[PDB]
Short mmCIF file of C-alpha atoms in Angstrom, two decimals:
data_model
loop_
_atom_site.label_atom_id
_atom_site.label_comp_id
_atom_site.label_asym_id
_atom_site.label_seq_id
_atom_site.Cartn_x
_atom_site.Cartn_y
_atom_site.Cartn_z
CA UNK Z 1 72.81 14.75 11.92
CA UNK Z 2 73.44 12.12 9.50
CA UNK Z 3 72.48 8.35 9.52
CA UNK Z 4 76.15 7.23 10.98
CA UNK Z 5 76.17 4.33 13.00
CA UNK Z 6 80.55 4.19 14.08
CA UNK Z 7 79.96 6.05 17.05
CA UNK Z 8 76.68 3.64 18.07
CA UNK Z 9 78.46 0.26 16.58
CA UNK Z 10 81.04 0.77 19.74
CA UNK Z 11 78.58 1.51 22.04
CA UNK Z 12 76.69 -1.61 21.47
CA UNK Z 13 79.67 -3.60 21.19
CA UNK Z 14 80.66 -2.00 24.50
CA UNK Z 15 77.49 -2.76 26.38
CA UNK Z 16 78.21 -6.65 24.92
CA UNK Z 17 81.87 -6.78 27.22
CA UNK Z 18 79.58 -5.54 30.00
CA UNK Z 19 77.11 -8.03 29.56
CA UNK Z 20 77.68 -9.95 32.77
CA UNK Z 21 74.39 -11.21 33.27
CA UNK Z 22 73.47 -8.66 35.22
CA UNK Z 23 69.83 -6.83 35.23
CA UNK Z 24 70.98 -4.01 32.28
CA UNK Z 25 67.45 -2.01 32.23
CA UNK Z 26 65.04 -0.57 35.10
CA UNK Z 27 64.12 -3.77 37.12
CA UNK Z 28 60.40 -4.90 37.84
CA UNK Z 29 61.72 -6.28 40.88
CA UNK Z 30 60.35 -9.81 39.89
CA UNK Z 31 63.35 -11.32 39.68
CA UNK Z 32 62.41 -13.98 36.59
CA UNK Z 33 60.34 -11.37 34.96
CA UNK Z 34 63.99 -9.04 34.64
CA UNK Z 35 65.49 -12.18 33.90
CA UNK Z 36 63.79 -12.41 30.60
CA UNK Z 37 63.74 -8.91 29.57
CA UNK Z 38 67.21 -8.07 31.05
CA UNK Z 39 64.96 -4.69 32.26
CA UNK Z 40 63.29 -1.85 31.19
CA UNK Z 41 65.14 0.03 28.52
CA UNK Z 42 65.08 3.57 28.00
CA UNK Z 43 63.12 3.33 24.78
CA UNK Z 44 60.49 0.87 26.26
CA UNK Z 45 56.65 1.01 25.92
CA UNK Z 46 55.20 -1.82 28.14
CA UNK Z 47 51.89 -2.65 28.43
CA UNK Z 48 50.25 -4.52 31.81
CA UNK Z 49 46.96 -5.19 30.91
CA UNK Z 50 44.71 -7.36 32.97
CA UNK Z 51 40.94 -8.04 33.26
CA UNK Z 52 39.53 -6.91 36.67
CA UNK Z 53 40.30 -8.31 40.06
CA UNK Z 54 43.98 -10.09 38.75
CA UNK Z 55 45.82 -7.23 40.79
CA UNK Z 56 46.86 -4.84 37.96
CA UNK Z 57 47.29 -1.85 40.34
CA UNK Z 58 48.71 -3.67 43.21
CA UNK Z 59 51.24 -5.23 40.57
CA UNK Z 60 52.04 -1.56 38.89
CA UNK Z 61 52.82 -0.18 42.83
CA UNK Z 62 54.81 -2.72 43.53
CA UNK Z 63 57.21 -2.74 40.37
CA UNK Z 64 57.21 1.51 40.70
CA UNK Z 65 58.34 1.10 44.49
CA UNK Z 66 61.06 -1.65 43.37
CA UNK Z 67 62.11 0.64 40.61
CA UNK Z 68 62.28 3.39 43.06
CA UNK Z 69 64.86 1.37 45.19
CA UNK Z 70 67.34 1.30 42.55
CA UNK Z 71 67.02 5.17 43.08
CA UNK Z 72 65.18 5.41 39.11
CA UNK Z 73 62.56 8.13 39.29
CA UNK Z 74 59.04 7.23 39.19
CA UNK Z 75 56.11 9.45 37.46
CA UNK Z 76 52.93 7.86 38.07
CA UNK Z 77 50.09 9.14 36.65
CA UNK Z 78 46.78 8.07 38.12
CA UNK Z 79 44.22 8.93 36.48
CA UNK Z 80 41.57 6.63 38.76
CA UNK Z 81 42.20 7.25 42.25
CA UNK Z 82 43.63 10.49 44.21
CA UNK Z 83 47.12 10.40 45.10
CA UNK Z 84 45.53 10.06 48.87
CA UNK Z 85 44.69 6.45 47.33
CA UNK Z 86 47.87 5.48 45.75
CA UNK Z 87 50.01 6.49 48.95
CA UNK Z 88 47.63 4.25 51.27
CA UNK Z 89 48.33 1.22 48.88
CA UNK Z 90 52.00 2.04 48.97
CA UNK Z 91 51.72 2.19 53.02
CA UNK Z 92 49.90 -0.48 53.29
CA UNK Z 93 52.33 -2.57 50.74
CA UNK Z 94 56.11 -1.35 52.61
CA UNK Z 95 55.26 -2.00 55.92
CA UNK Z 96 53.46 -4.77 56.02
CA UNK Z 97 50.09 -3.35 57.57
CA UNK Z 98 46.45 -4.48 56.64
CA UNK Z 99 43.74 -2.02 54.48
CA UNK Z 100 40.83 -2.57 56.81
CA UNK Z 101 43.07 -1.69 60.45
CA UNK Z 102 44.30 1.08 58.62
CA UNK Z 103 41.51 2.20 56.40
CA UNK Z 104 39.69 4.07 59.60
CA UNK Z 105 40.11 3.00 62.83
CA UNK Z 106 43.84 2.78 63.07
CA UNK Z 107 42.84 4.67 65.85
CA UNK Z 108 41.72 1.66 67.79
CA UNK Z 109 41.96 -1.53 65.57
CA UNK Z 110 45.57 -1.46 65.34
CA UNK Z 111 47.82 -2.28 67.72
CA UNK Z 112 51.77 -2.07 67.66
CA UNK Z 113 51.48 -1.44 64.01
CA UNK Z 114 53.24 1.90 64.58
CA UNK Z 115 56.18 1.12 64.47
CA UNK Z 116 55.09 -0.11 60.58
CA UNK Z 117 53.81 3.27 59.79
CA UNK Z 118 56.52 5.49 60.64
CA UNK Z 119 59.10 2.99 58.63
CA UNK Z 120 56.66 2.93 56.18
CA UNK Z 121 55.87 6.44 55.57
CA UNK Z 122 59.60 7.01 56.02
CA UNK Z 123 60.18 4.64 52.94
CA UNK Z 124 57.50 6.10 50.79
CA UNK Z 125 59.34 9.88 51.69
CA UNK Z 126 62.19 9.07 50.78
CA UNK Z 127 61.15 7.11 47.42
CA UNK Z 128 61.18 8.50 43.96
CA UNK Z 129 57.68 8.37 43.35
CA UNK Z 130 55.67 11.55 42.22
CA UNK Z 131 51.90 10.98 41.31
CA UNK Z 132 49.97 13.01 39.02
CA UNK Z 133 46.33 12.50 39.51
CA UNK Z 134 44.36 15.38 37.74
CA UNK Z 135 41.46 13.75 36.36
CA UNK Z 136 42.07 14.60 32.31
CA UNK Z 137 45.27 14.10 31.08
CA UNK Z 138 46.44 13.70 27.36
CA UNK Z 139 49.44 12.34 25.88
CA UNK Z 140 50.42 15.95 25.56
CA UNK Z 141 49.77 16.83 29.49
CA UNK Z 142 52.34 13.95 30.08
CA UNK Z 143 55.35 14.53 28.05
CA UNK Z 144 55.31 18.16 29.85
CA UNK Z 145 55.42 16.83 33.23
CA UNK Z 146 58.01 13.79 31.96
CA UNK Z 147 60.26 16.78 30.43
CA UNK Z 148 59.56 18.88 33.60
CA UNK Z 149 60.84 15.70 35.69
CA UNK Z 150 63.55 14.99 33.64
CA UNK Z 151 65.06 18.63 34.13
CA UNK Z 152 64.37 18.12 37.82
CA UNK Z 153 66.68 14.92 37.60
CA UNK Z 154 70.14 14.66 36.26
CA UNK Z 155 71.39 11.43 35.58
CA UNK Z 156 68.63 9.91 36.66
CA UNK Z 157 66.25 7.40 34.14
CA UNK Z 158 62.47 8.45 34.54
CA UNK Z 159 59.68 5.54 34.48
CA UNK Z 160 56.29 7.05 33.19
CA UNK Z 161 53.30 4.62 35.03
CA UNK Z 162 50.05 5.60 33.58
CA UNK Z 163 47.03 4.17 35.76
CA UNK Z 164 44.89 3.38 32.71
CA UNK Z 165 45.78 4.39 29.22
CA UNK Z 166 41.87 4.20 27.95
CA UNK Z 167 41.13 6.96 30.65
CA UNK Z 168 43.52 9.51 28.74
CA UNK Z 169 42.10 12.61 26.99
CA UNK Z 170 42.49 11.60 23.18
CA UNK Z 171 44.60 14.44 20.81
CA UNK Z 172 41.10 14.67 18.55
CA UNK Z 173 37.78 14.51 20.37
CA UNK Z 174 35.59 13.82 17.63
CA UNK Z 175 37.25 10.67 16.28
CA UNK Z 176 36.53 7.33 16.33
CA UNK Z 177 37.16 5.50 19.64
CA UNK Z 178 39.67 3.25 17.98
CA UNK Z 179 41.20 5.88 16.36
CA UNK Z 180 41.44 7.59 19.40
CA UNK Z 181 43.41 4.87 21.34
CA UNK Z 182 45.89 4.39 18.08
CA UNK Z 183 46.57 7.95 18.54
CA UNK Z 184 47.33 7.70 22.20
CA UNK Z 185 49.41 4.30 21.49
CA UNK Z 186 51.67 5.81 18.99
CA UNK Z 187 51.91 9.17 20.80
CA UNK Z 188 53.04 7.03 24.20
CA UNK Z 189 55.95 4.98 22.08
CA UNK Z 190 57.11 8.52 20.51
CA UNK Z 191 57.16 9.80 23.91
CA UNK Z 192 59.31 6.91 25.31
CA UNK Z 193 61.34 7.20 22.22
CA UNK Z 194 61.82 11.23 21.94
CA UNK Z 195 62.60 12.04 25.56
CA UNK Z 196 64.32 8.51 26.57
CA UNK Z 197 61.95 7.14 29.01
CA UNK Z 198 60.03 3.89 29.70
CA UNK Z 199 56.64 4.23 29.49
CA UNK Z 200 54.51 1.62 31.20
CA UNK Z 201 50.87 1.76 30.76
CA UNK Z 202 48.21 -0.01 32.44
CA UNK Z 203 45.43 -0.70 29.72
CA UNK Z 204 41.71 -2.64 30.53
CA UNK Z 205 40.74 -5.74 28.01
CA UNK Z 206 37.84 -6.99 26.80
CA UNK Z 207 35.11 -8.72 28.72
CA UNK Z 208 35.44 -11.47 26.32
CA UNK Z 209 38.03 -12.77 27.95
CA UNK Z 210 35.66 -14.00 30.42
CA UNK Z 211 33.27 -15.88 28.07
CA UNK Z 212 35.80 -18.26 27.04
CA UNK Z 213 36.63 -21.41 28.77
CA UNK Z 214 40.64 -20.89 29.16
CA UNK Z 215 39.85 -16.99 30.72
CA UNK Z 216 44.30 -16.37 29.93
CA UNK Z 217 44.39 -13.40 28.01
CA UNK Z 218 45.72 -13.70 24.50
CA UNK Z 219 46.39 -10.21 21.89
CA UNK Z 220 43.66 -10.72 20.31
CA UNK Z 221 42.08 -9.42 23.77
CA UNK Z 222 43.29 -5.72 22.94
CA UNK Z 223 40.63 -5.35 20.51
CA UNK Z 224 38.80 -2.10 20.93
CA UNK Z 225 42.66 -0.29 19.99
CA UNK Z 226 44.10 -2.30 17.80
CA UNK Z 227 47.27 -0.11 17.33
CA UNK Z 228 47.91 -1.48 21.03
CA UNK Z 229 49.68 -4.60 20.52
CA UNK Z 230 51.91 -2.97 17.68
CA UNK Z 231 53.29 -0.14 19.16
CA UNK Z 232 54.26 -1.82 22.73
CA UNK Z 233 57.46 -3.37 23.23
CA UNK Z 234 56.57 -5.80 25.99
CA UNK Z 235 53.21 -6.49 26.74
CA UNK Z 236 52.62 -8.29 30.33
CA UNK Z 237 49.29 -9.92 31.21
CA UNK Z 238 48.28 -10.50 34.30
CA UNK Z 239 45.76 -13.60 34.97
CA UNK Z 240 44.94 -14.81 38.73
CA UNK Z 241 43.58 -18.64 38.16
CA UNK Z 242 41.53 -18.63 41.64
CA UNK Z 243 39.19 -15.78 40.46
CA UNK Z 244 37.84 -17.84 37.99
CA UNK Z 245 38.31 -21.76 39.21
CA UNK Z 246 37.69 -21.61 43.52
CA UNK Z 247 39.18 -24.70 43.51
CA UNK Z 248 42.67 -23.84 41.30
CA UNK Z 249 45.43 -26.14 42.35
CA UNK Z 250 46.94 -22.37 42.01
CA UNK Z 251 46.16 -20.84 44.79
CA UNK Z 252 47.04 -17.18 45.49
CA UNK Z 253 49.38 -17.47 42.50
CA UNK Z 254 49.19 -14.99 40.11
CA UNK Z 255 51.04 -15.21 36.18
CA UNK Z 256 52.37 -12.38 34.42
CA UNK Z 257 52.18 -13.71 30.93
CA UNK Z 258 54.41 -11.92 28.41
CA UNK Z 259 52.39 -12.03 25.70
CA UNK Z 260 55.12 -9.41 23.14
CA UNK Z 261 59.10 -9.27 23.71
CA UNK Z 262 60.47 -7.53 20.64
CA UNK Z 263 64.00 -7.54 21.86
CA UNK Z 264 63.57 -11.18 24.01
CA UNK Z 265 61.87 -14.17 24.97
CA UNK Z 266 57.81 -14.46 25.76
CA UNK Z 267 56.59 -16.88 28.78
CA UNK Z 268 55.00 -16.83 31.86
CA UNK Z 269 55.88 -15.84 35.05
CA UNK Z 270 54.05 -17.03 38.24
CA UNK Z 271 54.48 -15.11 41.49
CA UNK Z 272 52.34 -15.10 45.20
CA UNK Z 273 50.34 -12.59 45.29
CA UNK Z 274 49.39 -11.60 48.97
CA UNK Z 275 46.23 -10.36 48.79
CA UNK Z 276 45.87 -8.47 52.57
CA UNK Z 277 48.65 -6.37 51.45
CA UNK Z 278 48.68 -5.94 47.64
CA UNK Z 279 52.14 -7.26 47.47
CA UNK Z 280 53.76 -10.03 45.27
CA UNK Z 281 56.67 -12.67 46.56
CA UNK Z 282 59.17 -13.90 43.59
CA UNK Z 283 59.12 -17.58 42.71
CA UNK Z 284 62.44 -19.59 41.96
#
């Protein structure tokens, strides 16, 4: 193995005669968002980090179904909620039905909604997705089951979702808490890097955010890991306007501010967001 680049200098100028302006990468399915970063690449480590209540989860389910529709193969690894939980949202989300009808009393509250179900648990079937919700999982615990999956798919490219990257079990216990979450950043890029997958993690920020007057979050925000902003490739906030202004001539609009493109341009992207349903409609 030597440091020869002939056999990678085609390649590259081969992917540059296919460059038709076509999505190259794993989609979001936000059509402006993959219009900037051209998609996920295989070596990727993206951050979506978001302050509470700007629909971080609903925004992660939604870009792992849409990557599961170009067939890709989704690992999520939720570290929060059951995967009970996650398949509910993802219910609720493909067919259009609301949390509350469903939650209980689908029973009796709903009415032809049926219908809905049935094409919606047929979708979520026959989707990509697998969820791994054990409560402690390391960096470790994941590049097993990533490996594992990537056996159990050919040619497929593998998407590693982690619901909350300051949840997972740190490599040494008794370090430093910033040390901790450096190890886990650079440990999450290797893994990306050594077995050729994007790995999107959902990460927290601080509550700092809040006590400014423009609440947007900015890199600074990462602070408690530091290592964070270095290691990630693309790094997508998410900021919903009408959780902090009721009166936001923004209504229901939430912006995924990319805040790092290594390879690419940063800016904002605004989408809907419908609430009821934890789902999010592309903007022109």
């Amino acid at each position: 193995d030597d440091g020869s680049i002939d056999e990678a200098l085609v390649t590259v100028y081969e992917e540059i005669e296919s460059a038709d302006g076509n999505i190259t990468g794993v989609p979001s399915g936000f059509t402006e968002l993959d219009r900037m970063t051209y998609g996920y690449k295989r070596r990727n480590f993206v951050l979506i980090a978001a302050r509470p209540s700007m629909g971080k989860t609903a925004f992660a389910l939604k870009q792992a179904k849409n990557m599961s529709d170009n067939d890709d193969v989704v690992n999520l690894h939720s570290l929060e909620m059951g995967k009970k939980e996650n398949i509910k949202r993802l219910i609720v989300t493909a067919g259009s039905i609301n949390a509350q009808k469903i939650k209980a009393a689908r029973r009796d509250f709903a009415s032809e909604d049926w219908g809905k179900l049935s094409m919606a648990i047929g979708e979520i079937s026959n989707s990509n997705i697998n969820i791994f919700d054990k409560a402690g999982q390391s960096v470790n615990y994941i590049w097993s089951k990533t490996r594992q999956t990537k056996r159990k798919n050919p040619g497929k490219r593998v998407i590693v979702m982690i619901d909350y990257l300051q949840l997972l079990e740190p490599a040494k216990a008794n370090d430093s808490r910033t040390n901790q979450i450096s190890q886990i950043s650079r440990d999450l890029k290797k893994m990306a890097r050594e077995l050729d997958v994007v790995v999107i993690a959902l990460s927290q920020l601080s509550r700092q955010v809040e006590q400014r007057q423009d609440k947007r979050p900015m890199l600074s925000d990462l602070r408690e890991s530091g290592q964070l902003e270095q290691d990630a490739d693309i790094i997508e906030f998410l900021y919903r306007d009408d959780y902090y202004d009721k009166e936001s001539e923004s209504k229901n609009i939430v912006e995924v501010i990319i805040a790092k493109h290594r390879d690419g341009p940063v800016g904002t992207v605004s989408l809907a967001f419908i609430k009821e349903y934890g789902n999010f409609v592309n903007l022109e």
